[PDB]
């Protein structure tokens, strides 16, 4: 369960400065796509029957948790058993303590079909730092600086969930402008 510094070198277009960040042993849940919530039929029904849409409220429930032990199978391979002492750590960051990486167009979403298993992404984030010249080479890396935020999620309180455990997050969206689902039959410059 290592924390690692994400630190590529820079030397073809680079970013404005070399990026630096941290990779954590935590996973996180990404469900930030509309097509997860609507089947194709339901989305047709939405756009056929309603003039606008806005997000209102969200609930995330984790249920049927199984922490599964693995051991060697007779005759080779491995076999799996349910663990009564294994725990799934769940940390819900209501405070936004931790760098927010959702909503970046990344390939991290829940599967589009309900028949597919979600493999939640590893949590990793970029932070500010100081650009240090790599000796004579003139190539550059961003080294950590006093401003560089190193977050250790194990330093906070989080829930330990056993097998069969359930936990629920709830969120209310702020008021936001609805997306208009209906178009225009006129050019505004031809009124």
């Amino acid at each position: 369960h290592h924390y690692k510094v994400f630190s590529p070198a820079a030397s073809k277009v680079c970013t404005i400065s070399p990026i630096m960040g941290y990779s954590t042993p935590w996973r996180y849940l990404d469900f930030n796509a509309l097509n997860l919530f609507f089947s194709p039929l339901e989305f047709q029904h939405l756009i056929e029957n309603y003039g606008s849409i806005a997000p209102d409220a969200l609930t995330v429930t984790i249920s049927e948790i199984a922490v599964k032990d693995v051991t060697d199978k007779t005759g080779g391979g491995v076999q799996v058993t349910d663990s009564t002492t294994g725990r799934l750590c769940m940390l819900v960051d209501h405070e936004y303590k931790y760098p927010y990486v959702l909503g970046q167009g990344q390939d991290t979403l829940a599967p589009e079909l309900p028949i597919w298993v979600y493999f939640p992404p590893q949590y990793a984030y970029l932070t500010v730092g100081d650009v240090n010249t790599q000796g004579i080479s003139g190539d550059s890396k961003k080294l950590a600086s006093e401003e560089s935020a190193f977050y250790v999620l194990e330093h906070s309180s989080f829930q330990l969930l056993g097998t069969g455990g359930t936990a629920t997050m709830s969120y209310k969206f702020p008021p936001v402008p609805p997306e208009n689902l209906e178009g225009c039959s006129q050019h505004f410059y031809e009124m």
């Binding site: 032990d69 051991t71 060697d72 058993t81």
Partner: peptide
């Protein structure tokens, strides 16, 4: 499970 050298099998 021996494929990870610092891992032990668990019987749950």
């Amino acid at each position: 499970v021996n494929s990870a050298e610092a891992s032990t099998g668990a019987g749950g």
